């Protein structure tokens with residue numbers, strides 16, 4: 619099954635998930651000189667004061683922190699979105715080296731990592747119905763660069779010991795995802811897809827211009843995770859990112875001049 623290695627990596631995905639070669643795939647390179655400012659964009663609204671994290675999971679491809687999404691406790695709205703999108707999980711992608719790791723790129727620049735706060739459109743009732751819709755998900759993408767430590771990430775970094783291998787999960791309650799946001803909400807937006815199989819084209823992407831800084835030590839601990847299960851041969855979870863895909867017939871809009 620799919621992964622990131624030479625034999626089951628992003629160039630193989632299309633054989634089991636033909637939409638890999640589709641019309642609105644993610645990630646993409648964000649050409650900052652081609653992105654247009656869009657005055658029709660309403661202000662973005664991230665309302666996470668009531669977020670309830672539950673658990674953290676190594677799924678063999680990344681780790682995810684999952685949230686209770688049985689009510690309107692953590693929601694994204696505004697910007698390009700119509701309606702209310704509920705936070706369900708965040709996932710991270712990172713590199714083997716500080717010069718690579720992000721899925722999206724900005725004028726071909728790769729960041730050390732990328733965070734996705736994944737939200738589903740409450741008009742579709744559940745996450746699994748939402749992914750079957752062209753406007754079913756809204757994902758907030760945040761770049762990580764290596765520099766100063768991010769205090770608000772350390773609780774994540776510290777629990778990774780307990781979820782080293784594929785299929786391990788741990789309790790992860792009372793984690794405040796607001797601690798992972800940069801100061802500015804200036805963003806670029808375009809229509810795209812999940813960046814892992816099944817690669818469904820159900821995402822409004824909202825990619826923040828301002829990266830967060832994390833320390834070398836923080837990102838180093840990401841790189842100690844394993845893709846393999848417990849008692850299998852150790853394969854470090856690194857370079858779990860898909861490269862940029864053709865833009866095709868899409869425009870990236872900017873929220874800012």
Ligand SMILES: NS(=O)(=O)c1ccccc1
Nearest residue numbers: 619620626630631633634
């Ligand atoms: N990556 S994929 O098309 O799902 C795949 C499945 C099995 C073996 C190799 C690759």
Ligand SMILES: NS(=O)(=O)c1ccccc1
Nearest residue numbers: 734736757811812813814
């Ligand atoms: N990594 S992503 O596009 O945000 C994604 C979100 C949910 C399921 C699978 C992938």
Ligand SMILES: [Zn+2]
Nearest residue numbers: 709710711734
């Ligand atoms: Zn992701």
